[PDB]
Structure formats: structure tokens, C-alpha cells
Nucleic acid binder design. Sequence first.
RNA 1: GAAAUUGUUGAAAGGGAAGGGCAUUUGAUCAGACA
RNA 2: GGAAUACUGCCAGCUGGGACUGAGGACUGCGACGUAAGUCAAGGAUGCUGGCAUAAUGGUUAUAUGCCGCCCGUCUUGAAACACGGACCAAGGAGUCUAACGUCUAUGCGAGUGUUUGGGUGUAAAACCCAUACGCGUAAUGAAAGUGAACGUAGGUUGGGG
RNA 3: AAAUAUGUAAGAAGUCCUUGUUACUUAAUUGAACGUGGACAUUUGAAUGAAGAGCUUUUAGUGGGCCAUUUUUGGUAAGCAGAACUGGCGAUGCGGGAUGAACCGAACGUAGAGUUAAGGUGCCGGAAUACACGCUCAUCAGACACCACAAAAGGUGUUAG
RNA 4: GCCCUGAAAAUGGAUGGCGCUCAAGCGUGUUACCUAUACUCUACCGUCAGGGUUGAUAUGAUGCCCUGACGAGUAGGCAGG
RNA 5: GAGAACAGAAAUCUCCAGUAGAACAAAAGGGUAAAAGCCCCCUUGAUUUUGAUUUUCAGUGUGAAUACAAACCAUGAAAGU
RNA 6: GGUUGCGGCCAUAUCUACCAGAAAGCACCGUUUCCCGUCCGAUCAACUGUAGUUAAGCUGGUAAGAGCCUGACCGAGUAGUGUAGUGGGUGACCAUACGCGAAACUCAGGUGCUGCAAUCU
Lengths: 185, 172, 55, 58, 56, 159
Amino acid sequence: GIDHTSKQHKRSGHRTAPKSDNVYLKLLVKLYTFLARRTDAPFNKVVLKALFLSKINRPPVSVSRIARALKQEGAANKTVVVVGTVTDDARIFEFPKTTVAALRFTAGARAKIVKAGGECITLDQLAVRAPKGQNTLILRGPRNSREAVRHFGMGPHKGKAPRILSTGRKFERARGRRRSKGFKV
Amino acid sequence: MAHFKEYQVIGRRLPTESVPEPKLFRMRIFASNEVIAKSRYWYFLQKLHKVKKASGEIVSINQINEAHPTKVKNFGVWVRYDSRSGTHNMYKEIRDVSRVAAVETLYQDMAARHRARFRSIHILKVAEIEKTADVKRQYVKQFLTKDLKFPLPHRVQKSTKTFSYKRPSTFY
Amino acid sequence: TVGPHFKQANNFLWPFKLSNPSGGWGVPRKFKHFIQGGSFGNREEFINKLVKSMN
Amino acid sequence: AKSKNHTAHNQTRKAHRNGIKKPKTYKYPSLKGVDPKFRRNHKHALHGTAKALAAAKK
Amino acid sequence: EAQHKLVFVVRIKGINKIPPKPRKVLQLLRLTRINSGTFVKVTKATLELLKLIEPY
Amino acid sequence: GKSHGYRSRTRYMFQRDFRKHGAVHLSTYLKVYKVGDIVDIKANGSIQKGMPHKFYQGKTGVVYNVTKSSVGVIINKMVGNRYLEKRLNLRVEHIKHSKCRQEFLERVKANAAKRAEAKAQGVAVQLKRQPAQPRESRIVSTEGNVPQTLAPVPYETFI
RNA sequence: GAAAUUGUUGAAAGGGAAGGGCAUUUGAUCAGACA
RNA sequence: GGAAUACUGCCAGCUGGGACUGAGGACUGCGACGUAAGUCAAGGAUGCUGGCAUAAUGGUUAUAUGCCGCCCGUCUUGAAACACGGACCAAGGAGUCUAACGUCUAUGCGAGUGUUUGGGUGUAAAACCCAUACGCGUAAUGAAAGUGAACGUAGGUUGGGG
RNA sequence: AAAUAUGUAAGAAGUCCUUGUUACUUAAUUGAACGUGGACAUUUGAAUGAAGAGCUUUUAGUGGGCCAUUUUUGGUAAGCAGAACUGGCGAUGCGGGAUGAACCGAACGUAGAGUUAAGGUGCCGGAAUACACGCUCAUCAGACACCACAAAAGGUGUUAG
RNA sequence: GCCCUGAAAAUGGAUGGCGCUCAAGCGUGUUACCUAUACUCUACCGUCAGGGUUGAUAUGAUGCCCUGACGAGUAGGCAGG
RNA sequence: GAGAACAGAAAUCUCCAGUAGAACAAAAGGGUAAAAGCCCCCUUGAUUUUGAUUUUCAGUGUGAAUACAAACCAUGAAAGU
RNA sequence: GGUUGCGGCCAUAUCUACCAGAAAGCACCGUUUCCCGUCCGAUCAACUGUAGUUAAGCUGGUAAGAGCCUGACCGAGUAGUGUAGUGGGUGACCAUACGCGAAACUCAGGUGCUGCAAUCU
Ligand SMILES: [Mg+2]
Ligand SMILES: [Mg+2]
Ligand SMILES: [Mg+2]
Ligand SMILES: [Mg+2]
Ligand SMILES: [Mg+2]
Ligand SMILES: [Mg+2]
Ligand SMILES: [Mg+2]
Ligand SMILES: [Mg+2]
Ligand SMILES: [Mg+2]
Ligand SMILES: [Mg+2]
Ligand SMILES: [Mg+2]
Ligand SMILES: [Mg+2]
Ligand SMILES: [Mg+2]
Ligand SMILES: [Mg+2]
Ligand SMILES: [Mg+2]
Ligand SMILES: [Mg+2]
Ligand SMILES: [Mg+2]
Ligand SMILES: [Mg+2]
Ligand SMILES: [Mg+2]
Ligand SMILES: [Mg+2]
Ligand SMILES: [Mg+2]
Ligand SMILES: [Mg+2]
Ligand SMILES: [Mg+2]
Ligand SMILES: [Mg+2]
Ligand SMILES: [Mg+2]
Ligand SMILES: [Mg+2]
Ligand SMILES: [Mg+2]
Ligand SMILES: [Mg+2]
Ligand SMILES: [Mg+2]
Ligand SMILES: [Mg+2]
Ligand SMILES: [Mg+2]
Ligand SMILES: [Mg+2]
Ligand SMILES: [Mg+2]
Ligand SMILES: [Mg+2]
Ligand SMILES: [Mg+2]
Ligand SMILES: [Mg+2]
Ligand SMILES: [Mg+2]
Ligand SMILES: [Mg+2]
Ligand SMILES: [Mg+2]
Ligand SMILES: [Mg+2]
Ligand SMILES: [Mg+2]
Ligand SMILES: [Mg+2]
Ligand SMILES: [Mg+2]
Ligand SMILES: [Mg+2]
Ligand SMILES: [Mg+2]
Ligand SMILES: [Mg+2]
Ligand SMILES: [Mg+2]
Ligand SMILES: [Mg+2]
Ligand SMILES: [Mg+2]
Ligand SMILES: [Mg+2]
Ligand SMILES: [Mg+2]
Ligand SMILES: [Mg+2]
Ligand SMILES: [Mg+2]
Ligand SMILES: [Mg+2]
Ligand SMILES: [Mg+2]
Ligand SMILES: [Mg+2]
Ligand SMILES: [Mg+2]
Ligand SMILES: [Mg+2]
Ligand SMILES: [Mg+2]
Ligand SMILES: [Mg+2]
Ligand SMILES: [Mg+2]
Ligand SMILES: [Mg+2]
Ligand SMILES: [Mg+2]
Ligand SMILES: [Mg+2]
Ligand SMILES: [Mg+2]
């Protein structure tokens, strides 16, 4: 017998392939594992795993969040990579040029990129242009802006947003929510 | 505790800047190996001086061989031994060819007559009885008479097979 | 020699997996101390005859 | 029908499976509980040196 | 003789019914299995370890 | 029934140190504390205001704040399987500066010295601490010192 | 035209139950593989 | 005085009897022996000889023999229990569907999204098409009247993949 | 006034220099707090280990417990009742204690060879009717932990003091 | 110390049994010996992990090749069937 | 303890000794001597606002408590409280 | 070195009994118009530094002094204790193995150290 210092037969816990069944995503993976095996390049190993992430861990990157990252010093001629969909934002009135390599571009988003004379590229087109990922800027969407995380960690004095259907007063606003009725949280 | 050896064991009282070269005490110790003998040495020193193995040092460990291993000697022995109801000193006499052989059958005797396991006994002194008629115990004195002889009656021969065809004879 | 690099040297060695002793233990009960006629604790230079019978 | 009143038996085995996790250190702890008089002025002190380092890039 | 700086420890005792404190020392000395030995360099800070596990 | 009040069980814990009763000597209030100091907590029964709860007796913490008569201390108290952050508001009578870091502060400015005074000499440092090593060999003389042979003594009574 | 359960016939075992595990003797039966 | 010996320990000293195993399947390594060419016991068995070609070996089965083997299910700290149910066999026989939901996941589209109340249409309960709305989201906060989100590269600092 | 048990510390989130911000504070550019600029790398500051560390969400079963060594309360006591720390049983077979939930040994994939543990080796029954020194003779001897009980008090039985 | 007295219960009966007396009893020592699902070495199954491998012109890319460690289980969870 | 008419064991007066052997509502345990006890003087902070914190804890509530902030006040020569 | 004012540590500074103390200082000491307080100018308040005194305070020294402080292989490796065994014993209890280790006792030494400012044969 062995006095076991750690839980035996433990899985890595990290996704290995995508759980998705989309052949093309499977093909994109096939590409980037090869690239990640033979290029010793950090960008490809990161991109490989981003393809594995579920719709929750691929928040959309907006076209305006893109425009921002090019205003970083020396970042304006870099090609931005979004492993995930890219969405339009009517709130910026001036979008720069660039070249954006994503999984998907919404109708509105690809329009605004192209209207300014930019380029919408599929990830495989980006591998051909930059095998070692040269001159790339990877952007992730705001993961924790889901409505669900509002209710995570719910409890006394945590300020965490009840799970509720109908709202207004008369709904979970009185005893325990204010000093004049019972206590406050 | 086993077949015994005798050990000069010397240890002292670790040096201090204010008291370098401390005082060097020797003991003779009967043990089956040198690891017991050192444990045993420290067992008694903590019973006499203020020291423990942590604060002290063994300076040397040496086996002592019997001076005349083929000469029969009459030994008096001096023992302190705890019993069930209380502790008692003793003096026994042992006739044998080496101090180590002597200590062996002492411990055997204390176990058979007095039910004393090795932990209870202390050897106080073992020393050669020089002149005879300083032998004080009758079971040894029996063996010092001039021109001693005895038969070994009713001799029993160990048989090497399960059956015998003769019928034994205890003759001798 | 207990080198300057003993830590890295020794941790590099996987723990030795010895067999039970071949001549047995020499004791009727293992779980007293060596001095007490068992096998445990520091037995000093006698660790070699044991280990050799287990290697 | 009496029954066992209480014991801490088995409770430190449970505590040690996943845990006794060390306290979680942070550079920059909170000002929670800090003297308002101090903290009110401190709000301005920083705003002062922040305004400084801005006119240090001009 | 300069007291020994090097020691070889072999776990003599089986896996179970071991109190917690000696049991971690056994792990930190990498003796987690019976008759598995390792080398241990002797200092006060490993000497106290050898003290905790002597019965095993 | 049971009695669990705030000072329960604290009989000897808040007691005064024999022949040490009375006023607290004046140094206790001249000592000066800043945010970041490590302090030890020992409650003084003579000052009932600002008293630490008995759980924090004999506990070390880090002052997070400083007021007229008091310093706030934060303590990691472990409840269940985790630690939570408790912050305490203590009168200065219950708080002394901790020596727990002085061997570290001594050793930093010492390790800085033998660093400069070595490098400027051409290196060869060794400033990490080492445990007690086994001692070397030595030769003990017999000069004026012959071993004095001792034996076990017999049983006596003397009562 | 199953099963429980029954008759016949054939085989075998049976000193206060029977049935079961590992193993082999003996009897019966059978697959494969040589070329 | 000079040896021997025991005891303990070391030898990368030599050598005999016995047992189990023979995983792998071109080559590739580290070496060893040789003046050499070659050779080898060096990253896992080959060589030589014989017998049967069969119920011989092997499987199944019944029996005998050695050792072992308590009744299953259940509730229980604890059941083989002098706790319960169960004589036997077949066939039925127990986490379902719906309304509204939480976390996660897949998919479509994305500041939106949802054709299927309805209408159009049809090879007719399918498939295909669609106007107006409505729903949820895109604003919050107050009991309410109400008011309603850029000092600034949409901020400073510390860690931060790339 | 211990032993065991217990809080904190053992560096880059560190140390030293220069001298900015404020509405706090000072008699005071005094301080306090937060900074800009500068000096010193891994013997960068004890040991050992590290099949890595950190983090989030959701949900099962459970919420009768019982036993052993040690500490320990009530009770004459209890295979009784109630706490403490650990280890077990429950949920677990395997070797041993004949038998046995909890003891000893040791924790289980299917197998081969070897060595053992606890415990044993007259015969049952694998394994010395082995070696050695004593002791013991019982007209209800004795025979191995947990364990299946025996006491005061006695013996001119015998042994050694 | 061992032995004996002290020492009374109900079916017949238990050092486990037979039996054992310079023991096959009690104390103590020394060797040898026996045998666990444990230890050591090897084969094989599975689990987990680390590597390697999309170059056609044949057959598996959730694949193929190398290597290491691990394997008890009620209630219960998940997985592959 | 030693003293003073009625005055006695106990009345009021005085000196000496007095580490607290007293008192501080109440149970007990802490604590306290130019005080925290006794006498006197002045008062209403037992007030206003809304947060943090400690014990109990789920780190809910309640009870009780702590240390600040912002008032308005008390008292003291004042520091302060 | 003395003394004083303000101290820090808070008996090695306290307690008991005696002896000694130069110069300065402190003190005791004199007065009751005034502010102020008492049953009482004892305390307290003011005035004098004049009219007196080392008696007291205060400082120091003495004592096989009480106390207190410090130390030691004095006691004691004792008591207690962490760990171990299919250790002993009917039990109560005990011995051993690897560690940690007091208190009393006994003996020796000691009796305030010291910061700021002023002052003084
Ligand atoms: Mg919302
Ligand atoms: Mg939102
Ligand atoms: Mg041999
Ligand atoms: Mg053998
Ligand atoms: Mg045994
Ligand atoms: Mg071997
Ligand atoms: Mg009830
Ligand atoms: Mg009960
Ligand atoms: Mg309960
Ligand atoms: Mg090691
Ligand atoms: Mg109570
Ligand atoms: Mg409670
Ligand atoms: Mg109060
Ligand atoms: Mg029909
Ligand atoms: Mg069968
Ligand atoms: Mg055929
Ligand atoms: Mg055939
Ligand atoms: Mg051979
Ligand atoms: Mg092969
Ligand atoms: Mg055939
Ligand atoms: Mg056949
Ligand atoms: Mg055939
Ligand atoms: Mg048949
Ligand atoms: Mg059976
Ligand atoms: Mg029941
Ligand atoms: Mg029954
Ligand atoms: Mg029922
Ligand atoms: Mg029935
Ligand atoms: Mg059916
Ligand atoms: Mg129709
Ligand atoms: Mg149409
Ligand atoms: Mg219309
Ligand atoms: Mg709406
Ligand atoms: Mg509104
Ligand atoms: Mg610790
Ligand atoms: Mg390591
Ligand atoms: Mg790792
Ligand atoms: Mg639950
Ligand atoms: Mg529940
Ligand atoms: Mg309940
Ligand atoms: Mg146990
Ligand atoms: Mg249960
Ligand atoms: Mg279990
Ligand atoms: Mg088990
Ligand atoms: Mg039994
Ligand atoms: Mg058993
Ligand atoms: Mg044990
Ligand atoms: Mg039998
Ligand atoms: Mg046999
Ligand atoms: Mg016995
Ligand atoms: Mg016993
Ligand atoms: Mg007798
Ligand atoms: Mg027998
Ligand atoms: Mg015997
Ligand atoms: Mg096996
Ligand atoms: Mg399993
Ligand atoms: Mg399957
Ligand atoms: Mg309660
Ligand atoms: Mg209350
Ligand atoms: Mg004068
Ligand atoms: Mg005088
Ligand atoms: Mg004076
Ligand atoms: Mg004195
Ligand atoms: Mg015992
Ligand atoms: Mg004891």
C-alpha cells in the first residue's frame, strides 16, 4: 500500500478538444494543434485552447473594444485576434482601419470594419499570414458581464442581487432589506 | 539480552567556553552490541551526574576481552534488581571461564529464580574471587574439593530415526 | 560526502524500493527499538547488514 | 429517547481535506475601518500628487 | 569521530493506523511505502524529523 | 444552564501579574505606533475600556489604523476550514510592539554589511542561515584528566 | 407449446441436509491446430 | 617477544547446484574484446535433438479428494441470527408527463432576439413564406412626486497571458 | 511552574538615498499617509517535500453513530451514561488472536517467482519432539496481549536471596 | 520465585482439540524454519499523466507510437457501455 | 493598639500602626489607593446623526460591547475626560 | 561627587534599629493687610526671606537584620511529561526505549541604576 499524498486518478480538468461538434472548428483545431506542436510560439498554444472554450468563456469582443486596443502606443498596425465572434457597436462614430482575425463577425460588425477599409480574416487566414503569430494583439471579451454572475455569491452583506422573477417593490424589498423592517441584509 | 560483550565506555559532559576539558567518566558495560552499551552508559550517567546524552559526548568505546579466557575462575557478583513488590540488592557467585560467560548465566538465573527481565537488573560489581575460601556460596564450594569426580548416571542418547530396533540402554 | 549540491543530488534519486530482508529481521518483534531488541530507531552502522539483505 | 449531545470527532479530518487554507495576502489592502478624518484628507493628498504627475507629462 | 552527517532511513511500518504528525514527516521524507528508503543529511532541522518517526 | 458571556473563563487570563498591580507605567503611553507595525496582544485587566476579547489574548497582528487612544489591529482568526480577517480596536494598554521581526531586521542590515564588505573585497559571501550541523572530530586529552570509573549504586532507604 | 411441477428410460453420487470457491485424479464429451 | 586465530567489515576475487520468467520484433543507443578484420553475454532467447500428430495437449462436464464457504433482501452502532419479507414458477410490476425555473453545455443570430395568436401557401395536422404588434434585453434609483450615468486617452496604482 | 498543544516572523509586496502632494497634523515643510527619481539579483537570505498553484459555479448523500490507547465527569459498579485529542469500525476484504464489527499485521486489478509481517513450528497443521541455563509435581498443576476474572491472609513444599 | 491452601451452582465439556511432567508447563537466551490480497522483480488489463506523430502514394486523428505512476469501498456522483 | 466625665462588650473624641485584610446595588470572578472606594462642588454625554468593528455566528439576526467621524454640550486652571 | 526641578525603570529603590552628613539646596521655620480655605491659618491660601534650626524630613553608612534581586553539574536529570511495545502485575500500579524537563530545598554573591535642566568647596 501507498500512503497517498494526493487524490489518485485525477483528470487535468482542462478541456482537451472543443466540446463542439462543428467540423470546421474541428479543422481549425487540427490546424492549430499542429502549429502549436511545431512552432515553439506562445501565440499558437494560447489560440489552440481558446478554440476549446464554451460560449460562456468566449464573450463577444465589440468593434469599439477593438478600436480602443489600437490606441495603445504602437498598437495601431497590429492585427487583432478574437477567438470568438465580433459584434457591432453603434457608439463609436470613427472606426480605424486594421485587420481583424476572428471566428465570426456579425453582419453589422464586419460591415463597419470593411466600411473603414479594414480586413475581416478567418483564423486560418491568420495562420498563413502569421504562423508564429507575428504582430498580433489578442482581445478577450468581458467574461463577468453575464447576467448570471450577478447572482453568484449571494448572501448576507454581499450586495449580490437576488434570484427573482417579478420585480418592483412588494418583491423582496422589506424585512431584511431595510433598517425600518427587521434588519438590513 | 543476547550473547554478551564487555565495553569500556568513556564519555564527558560537552565542552563549554567557560569549562573546556570536562571530567571524563568511564563505565564497564555488558551489552550484546556497541549500540546498546552506549544507550546503557547514558542510562546510568543520568542516574549519577547531571547530564543527558543531548548535553554530553561519548569519548570512546572499547571492547574488553577476557584476560585469561581458558582459566576457570570463581566469580562473585553484585546485583540490584527490582522485583514486583520492591527492589533488593543481591550477591551471587558464578563459576565460569570469562566475565562475559558469567554475566550471561547471571541474567539467566535472575530470570529463572527471580523472574527478573533484563530491564530490572543492575550489575553492581563482578570481580574474580582470588583466594578460595573467599567463595561464600555452597553451590560453588561443592566444586572446589580436591580430586573431584562425579559420574553422569542414566545417560540418554538422542535417536536419529523414529524407530529403533534394539531397546535403549541408559548405561554409561 | 554530503556535497554542496546534496539536496539536488538526493532529491533526484527516486526513493529506493527495497524488498523485505532475506535473512529475516533477526528479531521476534519489529516494533520496539533496536536497543530493546526490535528493529526500529537508529541502529547506526548496523543499517548496512539490514539494507544489504533488503537490496 | 436520548441521543449523543455533541462531539468534535471527525471534524478536523473534514477540515483538512480541502482546507485550512492560508489567509490570502494582498498588496494594497482595504481602507475599511480607517479614520474618516485621515481618509478624507488622504483623498485630497493623492488627488494632489496625481495632478502633479499629470503636469509632469505636458 | 566527527558525528555522521549522512543517514539512510527505510520505512519499517505499514500504511495504516499512523498518527498525523509522524505521518506527514514520513511523506516529507518520501517514505510513503513499506521498505522504501531514502538518504537524509543530518542537521538539527532534520534530526528532529528523525525523532518524530522513530517507531516507524 | 451554560454561561458563555464575553469574559467567561478569563479568571487568570486577565489577572494582574503578582505584585505588578496598580497604574500602568508611563512608557506604555509614550510608545508610538504606525500602520504596518506588528503588535502582540496581551489584555490588561486594569483597563476595562478597549479590551481585546480573550480569543486574541497572546495573538500577534498588524496595525491597520491609528486613532486618539487606540490602534486598530487585523488578526487572521481561522473558523471552520478557512481564515477570516478580524479587525480589532484596541486601547494602547493592551498592545506591545512585537519583537517577532527583530532577528529579521537585525539580519537584513547585517546581511547588507557582509554583502558590501565582501563584494567590494571580491565576493565569497554565504549569508543564508544554516541549521545546527553535527560537530567535527576532536582529540580529547588525558592530561590531568584520567577517566573516573563509575558503577551503579545499590538500593538504600534513608527516610 | 417455455417454466414451476410430474412419469418413464439412461447415467452418477449419497454414514445427521443440499448447494458453492481454488486445484487435480478418473469418466464422459468437444473445439482448434498439424500437414 | 614473535606469530596464529576468532569476531566484525570490504573486494568493480574466482566458481558449483536449484527454481521461475523469455515481454520486445529490420536497423538506430551506451559499450566491451581485438594490432586488425572482426567478434560479444553491450536498448528483453536462441541453438541442437526427440516424441505425438492425436482427445496426446487443451476446453466443457459429472464425480472423488485436500483446504475453504452460514441466507438473501432490509432497517440498523451491530444480522447467519432466537429481528422482518420470502414455499415454487411464469407474466405484469415503481423518479413519469406538464407549467414556471437555477447552474452548465451545444447551436442560431447578436444590441438585439423570438416565423408557427394570426395571415399567406401547400404534394395538406408536415414543408415553405410573412405584415403589425407583443415578449424579454438595451437604465438605473426612490415608498413616492421624481431625477437619471465621461474632470480625464472612460481615470490612478499593483499583478497580468499575449 | 512544566511537557504536549498554540500566535507571529524568516525579503523584490524587500532595503537605503534624494525630495513632491494634502483640506489631516505640527510651534514649524514639523509629521502622517501616498508618491516621482536613484543603489544592490538570485547563498535573494533557514530545513524537507511539492504527480503543481490559484479560482468560480452547481448538485448528491448525511445531519440515530459505535469502538480502542491516552486525558476525563457522574455512578459501588456495568458489555452503563457523558466530554477531549488521535486512530479505527460503520463503508473493508486479506494474515494472525480457534471462534469474534472495532485488537495485532497489513489495506484488495489479473497472475508468476522470491522475501516477509503479526502469529507460529509434538499430532491435529505448513514449520526444529532445535539448542542453552534455571524453575515447577498440584487427590480439581500449568500453558501468551486485548480475553473471556480471582483477593486478603497463610504453608517446616521447594528455590534463590 | 514457582507450587499448595484460601477457591461454593445448577444438560456433559473444554489451555481450540488430542495430549503433555529433565514438557508439548513458567522465566530467559540463541539459531533455523513455516506463510498474507503486504514488500521486491516480471507479464497482462484498466485509470491518470507526460512526450512524439497529418508528408504523400491504403485501411482507424475521438486515432497511431514512446514513457511513468496508480488500482479497497456503503450512501452518493459522474462516465463508457 | 494606646488614651478621654457619666460610657459599660457596643455611643462620641485623639493619636499610632494599617498592600487593602474595606467598599464599589446584586451572583461570582476580575479590577481599583493622592482610586474605581468616602465627603463635597458643578451638572445631564442616560443627548443628536448615520456607518465600521468584537463576542455569540451561518461570520444571519437579536442582545451587549469597542474604536473613530460629524454635532451640540458638561466639567476642570488645564492636559483632558 | 552633592543637591534641586521634571523624570524612566518601578523593593538591588521596601521594612526595622542605630550612627554620620561640609558647602549649596531643600526643608522645618516667622506673619495674617491682602486673594483664598477651615469647627481650628494643622492642612489649604497669601506675606516675609526678615526673626530661628539641622531636631525632623532628605541623603548616606552600619546589621552572621526581615524582605527583595541575581547565580550555581545545591537539590535534580528528581517530580511531572511527548513518544513505543502481544513490556511486568489479579489488580492498584510499575519497569524499560527515544526525547523534553521543573518547583521547593541548599549554597554563594548583591542592596538601586539612570535621562534632562539648574546649582554648589
Ligand atoms: Mg438586467
Ligand atoms: Mg447590464
Ligand atoms: Mg543463509
Ligand atoms: Mg529462507
Ligand atoms: Mg512472536
Ligand atoms: Mg534481494
Ligand atoms: Mg427524543
Ligand atoms: Mg444511548
Ligand atoms: Mg444527533
Ligand atoms: Mg529524502
Ligand atoms: Mg457553567
Ligand atoms: Mg453555544
Ligand atoms: Mg463603560
Ligand atoms: Mg398444440
Ligand atoms: Mg460446479
Ligand atoms: Mg473435428
Ligand atoms: Mg479438429
Ligand atoms: Mg547460479
Ligand atoms: Mg519474444
Ligand atoms: Mg486430439
Ligand atoms: Mg482428456
Ligand atoms: Mg480433434
Ligand atoms: Mg453424469
Ligand atoms: Mg469450514
Ligand atoms: Mg436496534
Ligand atoms: Mg440470537
Ligand atoms: Mg418492521
Ligand atoms: Mg414468513
Ligand atoms: Mg418480467
Ligand atoms: Mg389537414
Ligand atoms: Mg412561398
Ligand atoms: Mg396587417
Ligand atoms: Mg420591460
Ligand atoms: Mg420609475
Ligand atoms: Mg509550530
Ligand atoms: Mg524538491
Ligand atoms: Mg509538477
Ligand atoms: Mg445539502
Ligand atoms: Mg441537509
Ligand atoms: Mg436534529
Ligand atoms: Mg487503534
Ligand atoms: Mg448505517
Ligand atoms: Mg471504513
Ligand atoms: Mg480493515
Ligand atoms: Mg482467545
Ligand atoms: Mg480474525
Ligand atoms: Mg501499535
Ligand atoms: Mg484435533
Ligand atoms: Mg508438520
Ligand atoms: Mg504470563
Ligand atoms: Mg498482561
Ligand atoms: Mg515460599
Ligand atoms: Mg504448542
Ligand atoms: Mg521457553
Ligand atoms: Mg497478487
Ligand atoms: Mg474502485
Ligand atoms: Mg465498456
Ligand atoms: Mg446556544
Ligand atoms: Mg446576553
Ligand atoms: Mg547650610
Ligand atoms: Mg541628624
Ligand atoms: Mg524632599
Ligand atoms: Mg538580608
Ligand atoms: Mg500495559
Ligand atoms: Mg513514571
